[PDB]
Design a protein around this ligand. Sequence first.
Ligand SMILES: O=C(O)C(F)(F)C(F)(F)F
Ligand SMILES: O=C(O)C(F)(F)C(F)(F)F
Length: 6
Amino acid sequence: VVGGVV
Ligand SMILES: O=C(O)C(F)(F)C(F)(F)F
Ligand SMILES: O=C(O)C(F)(F)C(F)(F)F
């Protein structure tokens, strides 16, 4: 699982 936020 992976996530990213800008
Ligand atoms: O996404 C993975 O690698 C996984 F192991 F299935 C999790 F359980 F972390 F979701
Ligand atoms: O990106 C990588 O090299 C990895 F090892 F999968 C981490 F777990 F750090 F995400």
